[PDB]
Amino acid sequence: AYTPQFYPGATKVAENRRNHLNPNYELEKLREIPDEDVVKIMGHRQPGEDYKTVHPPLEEMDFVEDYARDLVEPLNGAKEGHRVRYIQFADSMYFAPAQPYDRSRSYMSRLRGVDAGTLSGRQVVECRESDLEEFSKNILMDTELFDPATSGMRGATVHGHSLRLDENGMMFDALQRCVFDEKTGHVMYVKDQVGKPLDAPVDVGEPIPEAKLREITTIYRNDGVAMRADPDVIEVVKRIHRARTLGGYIPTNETFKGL
Amino acid sequence: RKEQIVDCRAVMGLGEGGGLAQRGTFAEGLRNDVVVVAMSPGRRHITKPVCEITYGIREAGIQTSVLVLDAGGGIPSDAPQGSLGSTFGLKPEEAKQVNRHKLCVIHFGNVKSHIIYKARLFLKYVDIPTIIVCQTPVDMEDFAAIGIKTKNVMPLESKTEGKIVEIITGVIRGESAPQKKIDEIIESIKKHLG
Amino acid sequence: MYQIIRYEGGVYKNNILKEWIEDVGGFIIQEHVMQLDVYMTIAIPQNEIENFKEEAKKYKGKIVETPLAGIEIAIVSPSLSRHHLPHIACDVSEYVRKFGAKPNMIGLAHGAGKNISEIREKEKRLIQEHDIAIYVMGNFESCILDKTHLFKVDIPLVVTGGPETLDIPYTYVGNLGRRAQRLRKGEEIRALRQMIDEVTKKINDKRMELSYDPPIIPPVVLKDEIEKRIDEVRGILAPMPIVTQLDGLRIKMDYDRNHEEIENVKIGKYLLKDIAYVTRSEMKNYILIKLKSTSE
Amino acid sequence: HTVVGKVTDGIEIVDFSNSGHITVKTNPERLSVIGKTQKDAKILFEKHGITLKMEGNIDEDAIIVEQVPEYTMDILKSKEVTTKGIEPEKLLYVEIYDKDAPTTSWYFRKVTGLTTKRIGTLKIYFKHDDISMFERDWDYSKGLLPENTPEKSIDSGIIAVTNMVKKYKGYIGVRTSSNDKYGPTGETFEGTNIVGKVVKNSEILKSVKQGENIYILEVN
Amino acid sequence: IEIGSYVRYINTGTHGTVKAIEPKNDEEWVLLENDIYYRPELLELVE
Amino acid sequence: LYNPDIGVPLGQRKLMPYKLSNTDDYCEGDDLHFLNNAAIQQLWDDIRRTVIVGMDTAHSVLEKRLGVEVTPETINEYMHTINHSLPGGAVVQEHMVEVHPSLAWDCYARIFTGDDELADELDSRFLIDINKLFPEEQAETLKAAIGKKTYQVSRVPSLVGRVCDGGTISRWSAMQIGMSFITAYKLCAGEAATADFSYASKHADVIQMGNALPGRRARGPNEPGGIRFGILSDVVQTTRVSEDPVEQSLEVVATGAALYDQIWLGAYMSGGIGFTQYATASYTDDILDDFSYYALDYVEKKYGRMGTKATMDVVEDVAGEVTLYALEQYDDYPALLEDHFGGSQRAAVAAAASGIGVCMATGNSNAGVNGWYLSQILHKEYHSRLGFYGYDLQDQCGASNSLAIRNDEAAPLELRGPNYPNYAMNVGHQGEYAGIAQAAHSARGDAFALNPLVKVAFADPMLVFDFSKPRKEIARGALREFEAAGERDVILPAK
Ligand code: F43
Ligand SMILES: C[C@@H](OP(=O)(O)O)[C@H](NC(=O)/C=C/CCCCSSCCS(=O)(=O)O)C(=O)O
C-alpha cells in the first residue's frame, strides 16, 4: 500500500501539523467537558430533547436505484434526518494550538461528511447535529486542539485573532463569552457561541501554560519557531508554485523537466 | 462672570493628528454642575457635537465636566437577544464621577432601539436628571415602554433610578451643532437645574 | 536620582513588569489601560535605567523620555468659550500632556477684551500655585501689548500669540493665535514644539535652582509614602488624585477634613508638618504640600 | 516584600557578586530537627539552652516527625520545644521521580512539604479497600499537564497525581494492588501521571483511617 | 377620561384603554392597557 | 464579582488617526471613504472625463477633400473655437441656448504634438509642452514614441460625467470637435466630409481611458472596470518628477487602490460601507513602503536593478525572501499587526512588496504577478490563514494563469485589468497589480508603461487633480482643503 506522510518539515510546528492531520494519532486530552455542557455552549438545541429533523429518515423516503450512490455508508445524523448545524472557533495568532487552515485540513482528514470553511480570523465546520456534537465533544473541545484562553468557540462577532492577549493571556472578545475566574484559575463560558447568556456558566478548564502552548502550536512565529528555521516547508511550497506555473504554461512532460 | 478652572485629564490624546480626548477618562470642572458624557473620543463624538455643547454651557456660566466612556459604543448586554457588534456599559467609577454632578447631558445617535436600552443601562446606576441629545426624533415615552423613569411618561414598574428630564433631537454626530440647538440645551439645563 | 519616564506597552504580562518595578524600588506614578495597551508613567532610580530598558524590550514595550513628567502647568485662557477653549487651548494642554506634565485649564473671568481685561487676586494665587503658566493670547500685536497686566505672576511664563514676534518683557512664542481648527499644519506643530522647548528650558533652570538646596525628601517618594499610609487616596474621583509638582504635592482631598491626618504622617523619622508646608489650596479646597529645603 | 533580617558585616561580597554562590552564615541556627534522631535533637537543643519534652516515640534513635513550635523564631522566643517521634515501622518510605515528571514531582514536594523539611505529611482524604487517596492543595496544582502517564498496567505501590485532564486534578493516591484500567486515584491512565512509588514500608496504608496523616521519607 | 375609555398618546398615537388613575406626588397619572403611566395633559379622549 | 453590565471597550486603534505614506498629514479613517473624500472623487472624475483625439486624419480630410489649407494659424483659431464650443457655447445654428460657464470652468481642450517645429508656433495657452513638463531624456523618449503627430486632449466638464455616465464623454467630445471644425474653417454645416470628421473623432483617432464591457458586465466605456493597469500606470505622473522607482510604484499602488478597490469594487460592484480599510492598508502607513524598500535593497544587493533576466529561480528567491521578511515584521511589531488586523490587508501588502521586488529584479510584469502569487501561497503556509474566504480565488489559479498562453488566461499585466476573468470580483488585488505593472518599468527607467499619449495628456498642469503626488492630494481631500469641480451652486437656491 501507501504509507502516508502528512506534511514536510522538521520543526515542532511541522510535527504538530502532521499530528493534527494524522487520523491515527490520538490527540492528548487536557480537560473533561460533559456532552450536555458542550451542547449548551453550542446553543443550538436544549439538552435532553430530541433532535429536530429536516427530512424523514432515509428508510422512509424513496430514492431511485443508484449503485454508486449506495456504495457510501451515510452518517447516523443523515440516517435519522437531523438538521445540519455548525460549530465555529477563533484562534489567536499568539501560539494557539490550532489554526484555521490546519483546522480545516484536519477536519477534512479525520471526520466524515463535514463542511469546513476557513477565514483569517474564523473557522467553521458544519455537520448533522448529532455527529457534530459527538466530534465537537470528543475531538474539538476535550483535546489539545482547544485552549480556553487563546482559542474560543464563537459565532457572531469574531475579532481578536491578530490582537494582543489581555492581562490573563486570553484572546480578545467583544462579547465576553468566556471570563477568567481568578479564584479557581479556570475559564468559564458565561455565554453560548452566538452570544446569548447561559443560565449556568460552564467550566472549560484552565488556560494551557505558555510553555506547552509553544510546544503544541501549529503557527510559525519569529519569536517561537520561524519558517526560516524550517527550510523544508519553504522548498515544498516553492515546488508546488513552480509545478502550478509549468502546468499552466504548457502541461507536457518536456516543460516539467524544468521542475 | 466667574473664573472657570478645569481639571484636564491625566493622559494624552489619540496620536498626533487625532483627537484630544482619550477613552475612559474624566475631566472635572471643579464645581460640579453639568457632566457631558461622550460615547467615545472619536470624531463622531468629540469636538464636533460634544465640545460644542461644552463651550455653550461654559458660555452660559455653568461649569462643565466632560467624561468619555470607556465602552460607550454599542448596545447593552441586557438588550433583547443580547448585544451585537459591541457591548455598552458603565463602570462603577464612571457612575460615581457622574453622580456627583447636579445634572448630566449625554449624546446619543440615530437608532431608537439602541438609544432606549443604552439610556436604561445608563440610568440603572445614575441617579441625577439627564438630558438626551440625539439625532433621530425619539418620543419621551418609548423609554417608559422598557421601564425608564421619565418626567412626562412614568412607568408602572421603574427599572431605573435616573430620570430622563429632556430629549433634544436634531443633533448629528460629527457635525457642528447650530446655535439654536445649543440655546435649546442651555434653556433646558437652566430650567431643570435651578 | 529618580528619573521619570513613560512606558507604553500591552496589558499582557504587565503585572510582572510592575512587580519588577516594585522590586527595584520604582514607583508607578500614572497608569491607564485603553483597550489592550497600558501607558505607565514610572519613576525609577537612575542606576536601573538600562535594566528597565532591557526589561521593557522583553515585553515589546516602548520607553518615551518625558522631560516634563514631574510638573503641573497652568494653561491660562482668557475664557472657556468657543473662541479659545475647544481649539488652541486644548491643543496646548494636550501637547503639554504629551510630555508628561499635568495641565489645568485656567479660564479667566474677565480675560477677554482689550481695555476691559482684568485678572483677579484669587486667579492670580491659583496660577501661582502651579510650577509654570502658559498664556494663550490673541493674534493682534496692539491688543497683546495693551494686555501685559495679565501676565503678572512670579511664576515662569511662556506667552503664545498670533504675531510671530512680540515686544513684551517676557518669553514669547509666535504663530499660535486664536484659531478654530485643530493644530495640524507643519508651522503650527513647529510653534508648539518651540513653546515646549521654552517651558522645558525654564523648568530645567528651576530644577537647578532646587538642586542648589535640595528638599529633604523627593516629592515622588513623598507621594508614595502618603499613598501607603493614607487609605483615602484610592477613593478620590479627581483625574490625578495626587499631583507631583516640582517641589511639593497636591492632595485632592478636603483640607478641612484631612489636613490634620496629612500633617501627622511620619516619614523616615520626621513628622510631615515639620518638613513640609501643608496649606489649603484655592483649587476646590484641596490640600497643597510644599516641601522645605535641607537648610531648614 | 517581607523583611526577614539583615546582613551585618561583609556586605561587599553581596555588593560585588553578580552571579553564582555566596557563603552566608545565619546567626540564629535553624532549629528544625525533623530528619534527625532524638538524641541529636536533645544535644542540639540543650546546647542552645532550650527546655525539651518528648511526645511520641521516646527511643534515642526514634526519628522526629513533628515539633511544636516548628519555627525557629517561635522556639527562641518561647524557649521550649515539644518533639514528637514516630515508630520505626510507621514511617512510609517513598522515592520520587524528579527526572521523569519534573512538574508533578515539584507539585508533590510542595504539597507534602518535602521542599522545606526532610519528612513530609500526607493526609488521607478518601479510602476504599485497596485505594487510599490523599488530600490535594488547590494552590500548587496549576501546571499539571499530563507528564508521566502509564503505558501498561500500573503495578502495586505506585504514587500518582491526577493531572488537569480529570475533574479531580491534583488529588494524590496509592493502591496496594494492580489493575490494567484505572490508576491509583480511580481515573483512567490518560488522567494520571506517576510521580513516585513506596519503596520500603507498607501495610500501614491499610490500617490508617480517613483524616489521619502518614509521614513520608524520600530515599531516592 | 375614565376607566374603560379610549385614549391615544398625542406624540405617537398609541391606542389603549384606561386601566386606572394612580395619583402620586400630588400629580395625576393615567395607566393604560400597556401597563404604562401617562400624563393627562398629553392624553385626550377619542370616540 | 462578574458584572455583565461593564461592557467591552473596542476599536482603540481605529480611533487613532491614519498617517499617509510619504506625507506628513494625519487624517481620520472616516475621511478616507471615497464618498467623504472629494479628492478621490475628483481623481475618478478627471480620469473619466479625458478623451484624446488624433487631429491628423481630420487635417488630411481638410487638405485633400475640402481643399482647405491647414497652417499653425488655422490650428490656433481652431483651438480658440473649441475651447469655447466644448464647454457648451454656440458656434452655428442661430438661436441656441448655452450652458452656464460657471458649471464648466474645468473644461479644457488642449493640444500636444511631437513635432517641435509645429509646437514652436502654437499658442502656449492651449499647448501641453512636452519639453517643459518632462526632463530631457523623458521628453525625447515621449517624442520618439509619439512621432510627428498632433493630438487634442478634451476634458469635458465633470458635471457631464456626474449627471450622465462615462460613455457620454467620447460622444460629447466628438460632437464639439465636429462643430468647431466646421465653424473654424468656414465649411458647409453638413456634407460627406463632415461624416469623415465625425467618424475619425468618434472611433478612428479617439483614445478612450477605458474600453466598454458589453454582455454580462454591462457597462459603457470610460468606466473604472475598463481601465487597464498600464493605462493607470501612465495616468500617474510621479515618473517625471521623481527618480525613486519604489516611490513611483507606490504612488501607482495608491492610485490603483483608491480607484479600483474603493470606487470600482466597493461601489460599482458592491455598496454601502465599501472597502476603505482594504485599500488604505496600501497607502496609509509606511508598512508597504518599508517592505518595498527592503525588497529594493535586497534586489540591488544580490541582483541589481536589471542585473538578471526573468527566470523561475529569481522569482522564487525574491518573492520568498520578501514574504518572509514581511511576515517576520508582522510578528515582531504588534503595532503593525493591529494596524493590518484583517488577513487580506496583510496578504495584499506582503504580496505587493514581493511582486514589486521581482519586478525591480527582472523588469517583467508577469514575473511580478508570479512573485505575488508565490507570496500569497507562502503567506498561507506561514500563518495558516490568508484572508476572507473568497479572497484567494485568483490567488489559487494565479500561478497557472500568470504565464499562460491560452486565450482566456493570457495577457501582459499592462494589458490586464478589472475585466480580466480572474480579477473581476475580489478586493485587495487590483491596485497592487497596477503597482507591479508600473514597477516593471520603473526598474528600467522607462518614460511610460503602455501609452505615451495618456502620460502626456495627464501631465497637463490644468487638471483639477494633481497626479504627480496622488497621496498628497488624497490627504488634502481628507482634510477638507481640496477644491473639486462638478459642483452646481450657481444654479441652486441659497440654503
Ligand atoms: C461583521 C461581518 C458580518 C458579515 O456578514 N460580514 C462582516 C461585516 C461586513 C460589512 C461591514 C458593515 C456592517 O454593518 O456589517 C462589510 C462592509 C460588507 C461589504 N459590503 O463589503 C464588510 N464586512 Ni467584513 N470587513 C473588513 C474586514 C473583515 C475581517 C476582520 C478581521 C478581524 O478578525 O477583525 C473579517 C474577514 C476575515 O475573517 O478574514 C471580516 C468579517 C466580517 N465582516 C463578518 C464577521 C462576523 C460574522 O461571522 O458574521 N471583515 C477586514 O479585514 C478589514 C476590511 C473590512 C471591510 C471594510 C473596510 O474595508 O473598511 C469590511 C467589509
Ligand atoms: C459582484 C459580486 O459577484 P458575485 O457575488 O456574484 O461573485 C462580487 N462580490 C463577491 O465576489 C463577493 C462579495 C463579498 C465581498 C468581499 C468580502 S469582504 S468581508 C466578508 C468576509 S466573509 O465572511 O464573506 O468571507 C463583486 O465583484 O463585488
Side-chain angles (χ1 to χ4, degrees), chain A residues 195-197, chain B residues 74-84 86-88 113-114 116-118 120-121 146, chain F residues 5:
Chain A
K196 34 196 95 153
Chain B
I75 45 175
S77 215
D78 80 29
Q81 306 220 261
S83 47
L84 171 85
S86 47
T87 310
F88 173 79
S113 71
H114 304 175
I116 48 162
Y117 288 112
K118 279 174 99 132
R120 187 171 79 172
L121 187 127
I146 58 166
Chain F
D5 306 331

PDB file of all heavy atoms in Angstrom, chain A residues 195-197, chain B residues 74-84 86-88 113-114 116-118 120-121 146, chain F residues 5:
ATOM      1  N   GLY A 195     -23.734  34.286  21.628  1.00  0.00           N
ATOM      2  CA  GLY A 195     -23.748  35.447  22.492  1.00  0.00           C
ATOM      3  C   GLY A 195     -24.923  35.552  23.442  1.00  0.00           C
ATOM      4  O   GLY A 195     -24.985  36.497  24.230  1.00  0.00           O
ATOM      5  N   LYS A 196     -25.868  34.614  23.381  1.00  0.00           N
ATOM      6  CA  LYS A 196     -26.932  34.722  24.368  1.00  0.00           C
ATOM      7  C   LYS A 196     -26.472  34.133  25.699  1.00  0.00           C
ATOM      8  O   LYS A 196     -25.834  33.079  25.725  1.00  0.00           O
ATOM      9  CB  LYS A 196     -28.205  34.025  23.896  1.00  0.00           C
ATOM     10  CG  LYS A 196     -27.993  32.790  23.059  1.00  0.00           C
ATOM     11  CD  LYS A 196     -29.270  32.413  22.328  1.00  0.00           C
ATOM     12  CE  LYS A 196     -29.292  32.992  20.929  1.00  0.00           C
ATOM     13  NZ  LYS A 196     -30.132  32.179  20.012  1.00  0.00           N
ATOM     14  N   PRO A 197     -26.777  34.799  26.811  1.00  0.00           N
ATOM     15  CA  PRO A 197     -26.252  34.360  28.107  1.00  0.00           C
ATOM     16  C   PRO A 197     -26.742  32.978  28.500  1.00  0.00           C
ATOM     17  O   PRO A 197     -27.864  32.573  28.190  1.00  0.00           O
ATOM     18  CB  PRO A 197     -26.777  35.423  29.079  1.00  0.00           C
ATOM     19  CG  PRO A 197     -27.111  36.595  28.229  1.00  0.00           C
ATOM     20  CD  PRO A 197     -27.553  36.041  26.918  1.00  0.00           C
TER      21      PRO A 197
ATOM     22  N   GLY B  74     -22.173  50.762  21.111  1.00  0.00           N
ATOM     23  CA  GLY B  74     -22.909  49.517  21.061  1.00  0.00           C
ATOM     24  C   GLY B  74     -24.191  49.573  21.862  1.00  0.00           C
ATOM     25  O   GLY B  74     -24.690  50.636  22.238  1.00  0.00           O
ATOM     26  N   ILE B  75     -24.731  48.388  22.122  1.00  0.00           N
ATOM     27  CA  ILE B  75     -25.971  48.256  22.883  1.00  0.00           C
ATOM     28  C   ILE B  75     -25.690  47.416  24.121  1.00  0.00           C
ATOM     29  O   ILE B  75     -24.795  46.563  24.097  1.00  0.00           O
ATOM     30  CB  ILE B  75     -27.086  47.635  22.028  1.00  0.00           C
ATOM     31  CG1 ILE B  75     -26.554  46.427  21.258  1.00  0.00           C
ATOM     32  CG2 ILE B  75     -27.662  48.664  21.078  1.00  0.00           C
ATOM     33  CD1 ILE B  75     -27.612  45.691  20.480  1.00  0.00           C
ATOM     34  N   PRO B  76     -26.424  47.616  25.211  1.00  0.00           N
ATOM     35  CA  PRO B  76     -26.144  46.866  26.437  1.00  0.00           C
ATOM     36  C   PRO B  76     -26.402  45.379  26.260  1.00  0.00           C
ATOM     37  O   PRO B  76     -27.145  44.944  25.377  1.00  0.00           O
ATOM     38  CB  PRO B  76     -27.109  47.475  27.457  1.00  0.00           C
ATOM     39  CG  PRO B  76     -28.159  48.128  26.651  1.00  0.00           C
ATOM     40  CD  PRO B  76     -27.488  48.612  25.413  1.00  0.00           C
ATOM     41  N   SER B  77     -25.754  44.591  27.116  1.00  0.00           N
ATOM     42  CA  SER B  77     -25.914  43.144  27.068  1.00  0.00           C
ATOM     43  C   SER B  77     -27.323  42.706  27.441  1.00  0.00           C
ATOM     44  O   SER B  77     -27.728  41.590  27.093  1.00  0.00           O
ATOM     45  CB  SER B  77     -24.901  42.476  27.997  1.00  0.00           C
ATOM     46  OG  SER B  77     -24.449  41.252  27.456  1.00  0.00           O
ATOM     47  N   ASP B  78     -28.080  43.555  28.130  1.00  0.00           N
ATOM     48  CA  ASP B  78     -29.446  43.243  28.530  1.00  0.00           C
ATOM     49  C   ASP B  78     -30.467  43.502  27.429  1.00  0.00           C
ATOM     50  O   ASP B  78     -31.660  43.270  27.649  1.00  0.00           O
ATOM     51  CB  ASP B  78     -29.785  44.006  29.824  1.00  0.00           C
ATOM     52  CG  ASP B  78     -30.171  45.478  29.605  1.00  0.00           C
ATOM     53  OD1 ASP B  78     -30.703  45.873  28.549  1.00  0.00           O
ATOM     54  OD2 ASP B  78     -29.940  46.270  30.544  1.00  0.00           O
ATOM     55  N   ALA B  79     -30.035  43.983  26.266  1.00  0.00           N
ATOM     56  CA  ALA B  79     -30.937  44.207  25.153  1.00  0.00           C
ATOM     57  C   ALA B  79     -31.503  42.877  24.666  1.00  0.00           C
ATOM     58  O   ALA B  79     -30.912  41.819  24.893  1.00  0.00           O
ATOM     59  CB  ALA B  79     -30.207  44.920  24.022  1.00  0.00           C
ATOM     60  N   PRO B  80     -32.664  42.902  24.007  1.00  0.00           N
ATOM     61  CA  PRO B  80     -33.273  41.650  23.535  1.00  0.00           C
ATOM     62  C   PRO B  80     -32.319  40.853  22.657  1.00  0.00           C
ATOM     63  O   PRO B  80     -31.691  41.391  21.742  1.00  0.00           O
ATOM     64  CB  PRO B  80     -34.496  42.132  22.752  1.00  0.00           C
ATOM     65  CG  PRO B  80     -34.844  43.434  23.387  1.00  0.00           C
ATOM     66  CD  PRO B  80     -33.539  44.061  23.769  1.00  0.00           C
ATOM     67  N   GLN B  81     -32.221  39.554  22.952  1.00  0.00           N
ATOM     68  CA  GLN B  81     -31.287  38.640  22.289  1.00  0.00           C
ATOM     69  C   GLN B  81     -29.837  39.099  22.439  1.00  0.00           C
ATOM     70  O   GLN B  81     -28.992  38.805  21.591  1.00  0.00           O
ATOM     71  CB  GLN B  81     -31.639  38.447  20.812  1.00  0.00           C
ATOM     72  CG  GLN B  81     -33.074  38.009  20.578  1.00  0.00           C
ATOM     73  CD  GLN B  81     -33.197  36.969  19.488  1.00  0.00           C
ATOM     74  OE1 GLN B  81     -33.528  37.284  18.345  1.00  0.00           O
ATOM     75  NE2 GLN B  81     -32.932  35.716  19.835  1.00  0.00           N
ATOM     76  N   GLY B  82     -29.540  39.812  23.521  1.00  0.00           N
ATOM     77  CA  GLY B  82     -28.190  40.266  23.774  1.00  0.00           C
ATOM     78  C   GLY B  82     -27.769  41.406  22.860  1.00  0.00           C
ATOM     79  O   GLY B  82     -28.566  42.009  22.141  1.00  0.00           O
ATOM     80  N   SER B  83     -26.474  41.689  22.902  1.00  0.00           N
ATOM     81  CA  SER B  83     -25.874  42.745  22.104  1.00  0.00           C
ATOM     82  C   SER B  83     -25.269  42.170  20.828  1.00  0.00           C
ATOM     83  O   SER B  83     -25.111  40.960  20.669  1.00  0.00           O
ATOM     84  CB  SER B  83     -24.809  43.492  22.910  1.00  0.00           C
ATOM     85  OG  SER B  83     -23.948  42.581  23.572  1.00  0.00           O
ATOM     86  N   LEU B  84     -24.935  43.070  19.906  1.00  0.00           N
ATOM     87  CA  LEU B  84     -24.332  42.704  18.637  1.00  0.00           C
ATOM     88  C   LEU B  84     -23.323  43.773  18.251  1.00  0.00           C
ATOM     89  O   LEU B  84     -23.562  44.964  18.462  1.00  0.00           O
ATOM     90  CB  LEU B  84     -25.392  42.551  17.541  1.00  0.00           C
ATOM     91  CG  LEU B  84     -24.914  42.365  16.102  1.00  0.00           C
ATOM     92  CD1 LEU B  84     -24.618  40.901  15.812  1.00  0.00           C
ATOM     93  CD2 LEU B  84     -25.940  42.916  15.124  1.00  0.00           C
ATOM     94  N   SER B  86     -20.892  45.334  19.444  1.00  0.00           N
ATOM     95  CA  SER B  86     -20.157  45.799  20.610  1.00  0.00           C
ATOM     96  C   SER B  86     -21.109  45.871  21.792  1.00  0.00           C
ATOM     97  O   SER B  86     -22.331  45.872  21.628  1.00  0.00           O
ATOM     98  CB  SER B  86     -19.499  47.159  20.357  1.00  0.00           C
ATOM     99  OG  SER B  86     -20.411  48.069  19.771  1.00  0.00           O
ATOM    100  N   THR B  87     -20.531  45.931  22.988  1.00  0.00           N
ATOM    101  CA  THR B  87     -21.283  45.916  24.234  1.00  0.00           C
ATOM    102  C   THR B  87     -21.138  47.258  24.936  1.00  0.00           C
ATOM    103  O   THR B  87     -20.020  47.734  25.144  1.00  0.00           O
ATOM    104  CB  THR B  87     -20.798  44.791  25.148  1.00  0.00           C
ATOM    105  OG1 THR B  87     -20.742  43.567  24.410  1.00  0.00           O
ATOM    106  CG2 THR B  87     -21.739  44.616  26.319  1.00  0.00           C
ATOM    107  N   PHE B  88     -22.265  47.856  25.299  1.00  0.00           N
ATOM    108  CA  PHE B  88     -22.279  49.123  26.012  1.00  0.00           C
ATOM    109  C   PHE B  88     -22.279  48.867  27.512  1.00  0.00           C
ATOM    110  O   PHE B  88     -22.887  47.908  27.990  1.00  0.00           O
ATOM    111  CB  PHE B  88     -23.505  49.941  25.613  1.00  0.00           C
ATOM    112  CG  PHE B  88     -23.692  51.195  26.412  1.00  0.00           C
ATOM    113  CD1 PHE B  88     -22.950  52.323  26.133  1.00  0.00           C
ATOM    114  CD2 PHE B  88     -24.624  51.251  27.427  1.00  0.00           C
ATOM    115  CE1 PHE B  88     -23.130  53.479  26.857  1.00  0.00           C
ATOM    116  CE2 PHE B  88     -24.803  52.407  28.151  1.00  0.00           C
ATOM    117  CZ  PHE B  88     -24.055  53.519  27.866  1.00  0.00           C
ATOM    118  N   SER B 113     -33.985  51.951  18.947  1.00  0.00           N
ATOM    119  CA  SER B 113     -33.886  50.777  19.806  1.00  0.00           C
ATOM    120  C   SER B 113     -32.550  50.728  20.530  1.00  0.00           C
ATOM    121  O   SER B 113     -32.466  50.188  21.638  1.00  0.00           O
ATOM    122  CB  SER B 113     -34.092  49.506  18.987  1.00  0.00           C
ATOM    123  OG  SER B 113     -32.984  49.261  18.144  1.00  0.00           O
ATOM    124  N   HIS B 114     -31.499  51.270  19.924  1.00  0.00           N
ATOM    125  CA  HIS B 114     -30.221  51.360  20.621  1.00  0.00           C
ATOM    126  C   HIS B 114     -30.278  52.400  21.731  1.00  0.00           C
ATOM    127  O   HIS B 114     -29.811  52.150  22.849  1.00  0.00           O
ATOM    128  CB  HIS B 114     -29.109  51.702  19.637  1.00  0.00           C
ATOM    129  CG  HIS B 114     -29.006  50.751  18.487  1.00  0.00           C
ATOM    130  ND1 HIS B 114     -28.135  50.948  17.440  1.00  0.00           N
ATOM    131  CD2 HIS B 114     -29.655  49.594  18.226  1.00  0.00           C
ATOM    132  CE1 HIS B 114     -28.257  49.954  16.578  1.00  0.00           C
ATOM    133  NE2 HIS B 114     -29.172  49.118  17.032  1.00  0.00           N
ATOM    134  N   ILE B 116     -32.790  53.658  23.473  1.00  0.00           N
ATOM    135  CA  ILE B 116     -33.639  53.383  24.634  1.00  0.00           C
ATOM    136  C   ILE B 116     -32.926  52.459  25.617  1.00  0.00           C
ATOM    137  O   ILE B 116     -32.887  52.717  26.827  1.00  0.00           O
ATOM    138  CB  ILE B 116     -34.998  52.809  24.194  1.00  0.00           C
ATOM    139  CG1 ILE B 116     -34.809  51.673  23.189  1.00  0.00           C
ATOM    140  CG2 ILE B 116     -35.865  53.904  23.609  1.00  0.00           C
ATOM    141  CD1 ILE B 116     -36.018  50.783  23.040  1.00  0.00           C
ATOM    142  N   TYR B 117     -32.326  51.380  25.112  1.00  0.00           N
ATOM    143  CA  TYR B 117     -31.671  50.432  26.006  1.00  0.00           C
ATOM    144  C   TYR B 117     -30.369  50.988  26.565  1.00  0.00           C
ATOM    145  O   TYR B 117     -30.024  50.709  27.722  1.00  0.00           O
ATOM    146  CB  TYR B 117     -31.442  49.109  25.282  1.00  0.00           C
ATOM    147  CG  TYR B 117     -32.729  48.352  25.061  1.00  0.00           C
ATOM    148  CD1 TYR B 117     -33.240  48.171  23.786  1.00  0.00           C
ATOM    149  CD2 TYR B 117     -33.443  47.838  26.130  1.00  0.00           C
ATOM    150  CE1 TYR B 117     -34.420  47.491  23.584  1.00  0.00           C
ATOM    151  CE2 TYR B 117     -34.622  47.156  25.939  1.00  0.00           C
ATOM    152  CZ  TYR B 117     -35.107  46.985  24.664  1.00  0.00           C
ATOM    153  OH  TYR B 117     -36.283  46.304  24.466  1.00  0.00           O
ATOM    154  N   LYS B 118     -29.639  51.781  25.778  1.00  0.00           N
ATOM    155  CA  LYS B 118     -28.455  52.435  26.313  1.00  0.00           C
ATOM    156  C   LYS B 118     -28.822  53.373  27.452  1.00  0.00           C
ATOM    157  O   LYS B 118     -28.143  53.404  28.483  1.00  0.00           O
ATOM    158  CB  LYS B 118     -27.734  53.194  25.206  1.00  0.00           C
ATOM    159  CG  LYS B 118     -26.846  52.328  24.349  1.00  0.00           C
ATOM    160  CD  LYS B 118     -26.287  53.119  23.198  1.00  0.00           C
ATOM    161  CE  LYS B 118     -24.879  53.570  23.493  1.00  0.00           C
ATOM    162  NZ  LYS B 118     -23.982  53.284  22.352  1.00  0.00           N
ATOM    163  N   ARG B 120     -31.456  53.108  29.375  1.00  0.00           N
ATOM    164  CA  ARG B 120     -31.872  52.300  30.518  1.00  0.00           C
ATOM    165  C   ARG B 120     -30.668  51.807  31.309  1.00  0.00           C
ATOM    166  O   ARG B 120     -30.635  51.915  32.542  1.00  0.00           O
ATOM    167  CB  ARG B 120     -32.726  51.122  30.059  1.00  0.00           C
ATOM    168  CG  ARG B 120     -33.335  50.348  31.214  1.00  0.00           C
ATOM    169  CD  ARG B 120     -34.349  49.340  30.733  1.00  0.00           C
ATOM    170  NE  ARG B 120     -33.710  48.139  30.214  1.00  0.00           N
ATOM    171  CZ  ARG B 120     -34.360  47.038  29.875  1.00  0.00           C
ATOM    172  NH1 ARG B 120     -35.672  46.945  29.999  1.00  0.00           N
ATOM    173  NH2 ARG B 120     -33.677  46.003  29.396  1.00  0.00           N
ATOM    174  N   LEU B 121     -29.662  51.266  30.621  1.00  0.00           N
ATOM    175  CA  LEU B 121     -28.473  50.803  31.333  1.00  0.00           C
ATOM    176  C   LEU B 121     -27.746  51.962  32.000  1.00  0.00           C
ATOM    177  O   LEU B 121     -27.231  51.820  33.114  1.00  0.00           O
ATOM    178  CB  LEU B 121     -27.525  50.057  30.396  1.00  0.00           C
ATOM    179  CG  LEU B 121     -26.355  49.416  31.147  1.00  0.00           C
ATOM    180  CD1 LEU B 121     -26.237  47.940  30.829  1.00  0.00           C
ATOM    181  CD2 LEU B 121     -25.054  50.126  30.851  1.00  0.00           C
ATOM    182  N   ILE B 146     -39.903  50.448  28.202  1.00  0.00           N
ATOM    183  CA  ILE B 146     -38.979  49.437  28.699  1.00  0.00           C
ATOM    184  C   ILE B 146     -38.605  49.680  30.154  1.00  0.00           C
ATOM    185  O   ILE B 146     -37.728  48.997  30.689  1.00  0.00           O
ATOM    186  CB  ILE B 146     -37.723  49.342  27.817  1.00  0.00           C
ATOM    187  CG1 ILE B 146     -37.016  50.692  27.737  1.00  0.00           C
ATOM    188  CG2 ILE B 146     -38.092  48.853  26.429  1.00  0.00           C
ATOM    189  CD1 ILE B 146     -35.620  50.602  27.180  1.00  0.00           C
TER     190      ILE B 146
ATOM    191  N   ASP F   5     -22.718  43.971  33.108  1.00  0.00           N
ATOM    192  CA  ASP F   5     -23.049  45.294  32.601  1.00  0.00           C
ATOM    193  C   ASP F   5     -21.845  46.227  32.558  1.00  0.00           C
ATOM    194  O   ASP F   5     -22.018  47.447  32.567  1.00  0.00           O
ATOM    195  CB  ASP F   5     -24.157  45.918  33.440  1.00  0.00           C
ATOM    196  CG  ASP F   5     -25.373  45.032  33.542  1.00  0.00           C
ATOM    197  OD1 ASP F   5     -25.625  44.255  32.600  1.00  0.00           O
ATOM    198  OD2 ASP F   5     -26.082  45.113  34.565  1.00  0.00           O
TER     199      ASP F   5
END
